[PDB]
Design a protein around this ligand. Structure first.
Ligand SMILES: NC(=O)c1ccc[n+]([C@@H]2O[C@H](COP(=O)([O-])OP(=O)(O)OC[C@H]3O[C@@H](n4cnc5c(N)ncnc54)[C@H](OP(=O)(O)O)[C@@H]3O)[C@@H](O)[C@H]2O)c1
Ligand SMILES: NC(=O)c1ccc[n+]([C@@H]2O[C@H](COP(=O)([O-])OP(=O)(O)OC[C@H]3O[C@@H](n4cnc5c(N)ncnc54)[C@H](OP(=O)(O)O)[C@@H]3O)[C@@H](O)[C@H]2O)c1
Ligand SMILES: NC(=O)c1ccc[n+]([C@@H]2O[C@H](COP(=O)([O-])OP(=O)(O)OC[C@H]3O[C@@H](n4cnc5c(N)ncnc54)[C@H](OP(=O)(O)O)[C@@H]3O)[C@@H](O)[C@H]2O)c1
Ligand SMILES: NC(=O)c1ccc[n+]([C@@H]2O[C@H](COP(=O)([O-])OP(=O)(O)OC[C@H]3O[C@@H](n4cnc5c(N)ncnc54)[C@H](OP(=O)(O)O)[C@@H]3O)[C@@H](O)[C@H]2O)c1
Ligand SMILES: [Mn+2]
Ligand SMILES: [Mn+2]
Ligand SMILES: [Mn+2]
Ligand SMILES: [Mn+2]
Lengths: 260, 260, 260, 260
């Protein structure tokens, strides 16, 4: 099988990467960073997201694995001392594949599309943020605030969590929308609660006055000018994970927020 | 088709009920309150929940319809002035059926089972509330607080909403757990975020010291003594709704919280 | 100086109490549990609150000291290994006094008054909770929910904190009101935010339908029937603390919630 | 008395301004926009804040009055139809003065000072926001998130409110700090609760890595580069309000968020 390794670029990660490559040479496994089937990320969650966006054109051909040399390592399944055992099990093909939903963002002018593994958010180019929120072509609310966040299931432990969103098991094919500091008074009104949307629903944001927005997708943040629409839907594409040990989502959540 | 009507018992509701019965007599529709196929509720959401728990043994044989003479009327599809048109459309059979998920609660001693349309909650019999939260047999957290709430999708606009939970579209077969005033300090720790569980997962609450709990199911509240386990799962049973007009969940939410 | 010691009644606390009494005998200090000037509490925060309510008639004649053999120990200034040094410093009179504000609750029928060191809360006798909230004789809101909490400054780290309230430095002579799961929809509306009231303001709760309420004051909880009014104001009375080492409130907060 | 009027610049406001000037000519009142004693603002709250920052060097020489031709008008005491009666009462000197606390922000490099009527906030220049929070020279927490907000009492109905802060009566000489989307996980920890600081306390923010910050003061937002410290304290200076009718803060709050 062809494989690649992405390193956080610190010393431990580079060297762990050199050892694993050397380990893989002992199994006739071709390192190919153009068309791999297995992508290993050595670092934290930012390094893993970078690895994901490097290969966003080949998502179904690839299965990902993270190694935790970072701080939190939510998407990681392995600590550095397991790295040698990873090489072995991965070479003999003893793993099963797990798929998590992804988020499609579309931006139109007067079209760009993006895939997010954690979330996509929207803020103004500076100055007040005001958008209308249209759900399946019904006008739902006019949002005044700092911004909005739309999150995948596995993204709900991330920025979504800090905004009061719910944590969502990734077997549920959904996306979740949360507010950033909404204004609510006599004249302005938002739902307040996060909203959880099923696979077949479309949430569109439409400008009211200013048409420039700071749009983010995972760690990337781009300015879009003269925007007509930002459309959110659950993607048809999925990320595949290589699992060698049963490591349930809720245990992952527990270890990351409660203890160990 | 056999049918029954439940009234809030105020004057408008009783009289609207008398008129509809008289209307139904003109179509050879048998009023039967033992084995109806259609149950009409005239009142608010409490009246509708009562109607639901009256027939919890016959859920798949029945389709429900609510008429709003109450205050909020979330589960209502009709205002009183449409009542005459309801009789007609229902008699000629021009409706489609919509199904929403339900919540199964099981309580064990040393077993009682209940079905909830909004939610089931747990509090202490007075004195401190402390439980361990076990998800799919993995121990997730020890909860110290006032109580916990587990909510259906259509229940998320209800008590769940007031506790900071997310609103959840009812096409998603899930249940959602939210905290009531959790204690978080140097020594005590909860997740904080609401949790959204898929159909196949089991959440069990297990006592730590006191074993008496105030358990609620929709409007009903019962004391249980010497409790060993409270087990939550998404039910295999569903509630069926008779729909004559397309009335999407998110429009229902909008009309109930934003305007009109 | 006359003194008393209250023990949590576990083995460590009783024995630490016996040693300190024996230590105090070496200084001609009269143990008097009727009219002490110094009250030492050995246990956690519940033990300290009990000690406070034991002497609520003699608040300005007494200065309190807590010793932490409990779990959190927010009101504690000493760990058990410092107990011997406490005896000494307290006998030679090398301490300064610190005063924190208290909360006055008045309940009227058709009058009972209470002093709270943490907070006083109000819930229904079971069934729905609905009250009007009158501030300085202006009608402010009608509250529908689970209950309300009114907290002293030093109480804001306690139940208030779990309800989203702000932490408040005790040099500020104020009381703070927070909601328990308020209902907010098209027809029902509360402020949502906690409210912070100055010394000279009066907040009165007035029943709407049910007139029986579960009223709490610190760890005590009493049923009141046929209630006409619950009136909250910042008390004229203060609790005095004996301080031997500078131990600022914000450091106390840090040690209790962030680390150490 | 010398006086000036600031207009929102829409048609109603300009014309209401022309009429009031003409009204004031009938009383020998000198319009002076250099050294007035009375500053009238015609518009919404943004127009009023602009009026405040225009005269921040002469705060004790001036008393402010707002006229509501905007949308919310929190700082307004008058609607346009009262404008004629305002001219009269203000000319005959029948008013009393009300003073609200202000917030001092100091920024140091390797000093700029600002006065805020609502709040001052801090965010990064793009990229992650990380600061240490030092209270009275004790290190309290390391904040990771989107930013922080420090608010006056009368500012607590504003941005503070949208971030979950408490509303604070302006007789309390305090400032309140609230988080913008803090990150809390196994490794990162913030207090979460808002913090309310008394007049004599100093809160200093100190950079950890990036030293460029987007700092706001009311409607103004400035980039500061190579920042060493951001220091918050309750100002010695106060804003004076001209009151002709008793209009209590809590009634103002009620009218702005509950109804009318
Ligand atoms: N106010 C906020 O909470 C906020 C603001 C902006 C971005 N973010 C998150 O930061 C992500 C990307 O930034 P970055 O990781 O490259 O730098 P970063 O600023 O260090 O990310 C912040 C933290 O989020 C963690 N994280 C990332 N994905 C997660 C997930 N699915 N579940 C739980 N935690 C997760 C990171 O873990 P590691 O320790 O392994 O790096 C890190 O601890 C965004 O996708 C976004 O979700 C959060
Ligand atoms: N702190 C809280 O928020 C709280 C506490 C206890 C119970 N509840 C809710 O009250 C329900 C049953 O009580 P009740 O209706 O008989 O008396 P209730 O006290 O009047 O119910 C409270 C309000 O919830 C509304 N409601 C019920 N189901 C809803 C839903 N699926 N979505 C949105 N709103 C909904 C009711 O609407 P109507 O105006 O049509 O009656 C009423 O406005 C419980 O199942 C529970 O969800 C809420
Ligand atoms: N949902 C909630 O958060 C909730 C519900 C009811 C009561 N309470 C609190 O419990 C207090 C009395 O109960 P209890 O202590 O006898 O039994 P408790 O149930 O053990 O008290 C709960 C926790 O609050 C802590 N606590 C008490 N006063 C505090 C303060 N000023 N600041 C920070 N933490 C404080 C206690 O500390 P220790 O470990 O030292 O005992 C304990 O960790 C009430 O006054 C009330 O504030 C909280
Ligand atoms: N996410 C947020 O909530 C957020 C973000 C940035 C700024 N702000 C607020 O906006 C203020 C300045 O902006 P702006 O007014 O010029 O434009 P703005 O964006 O229109 O201000 C937002 C709203 O805040 C209201 N407001 C201002 N001061 C208030 C107060 N003391 N109490 C209650 N509401 C108040 C404004 O009232 P009017 O209708 O009369 O204009 C407006 O409704 C800032 O000082 C800041 O407090 C809020
Ligand atoms: Mn990272
Ligand atoms: Mn009801
Ligand atoms: Mn205790
Ligand atoms: Mn404005």
């Amino acid at each position: 099988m062809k494989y690649m390794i992405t390193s956080k670029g610190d010393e431990k990660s580079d060297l762990l990467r050199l050892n694993m490559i050397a380990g893989f040479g002992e199994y006739d496994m071709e390192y190919d960073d153009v068309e791999p089937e297995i992508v290993i990320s050595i670092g934290g969650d930012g390094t893993f997201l970078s690895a994901f966006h490097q290969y966003e054109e080949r998502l179904d051909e690839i299965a990902f694995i993270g190694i935790h040399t970072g701080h939190l390592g939510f998407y990681a399944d392995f600590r550095p001392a397991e790295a040698d055992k990873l090489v072995k099990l991965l070479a003999k093909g003893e793993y099963q594949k797990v798929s998590y939903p992804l988020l499609k963002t579309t931006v139109k002018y007067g079209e760009a599309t993006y895939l997010a593994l954690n979330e996509s958010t929207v803020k103004s180019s500076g100055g007040p943020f005001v958008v209308d929120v249209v759900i399946n072509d019904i006008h739902f609310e006019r949002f005044r605030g700092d911004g909005l966040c739309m999150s995948t299931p596995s993204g709900t432990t991330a920025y979504n969590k800090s905004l009061g969103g719910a944590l969502m098991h990734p077997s549920i094919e959904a996306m979740q929308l949360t507010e950033m500091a909404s204004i609510n008074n006599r004249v302005y009104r938002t739902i307040g609660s996060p909203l959880v949307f099923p696979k077949h629903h479309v949430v569109s944001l439409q400008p009211v006055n200013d048409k420039d927005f700071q749009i983010s997708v995972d760690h990337l943040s781009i300015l879009h000018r003269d925007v007509q629409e930002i459309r959110y839907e659950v993607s048809a594409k999925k990320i595949h994970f290589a699992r060698f040990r049963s490591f349930p989502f809720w245990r992952r959540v527990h270890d990351s927020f409660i203890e160990d």
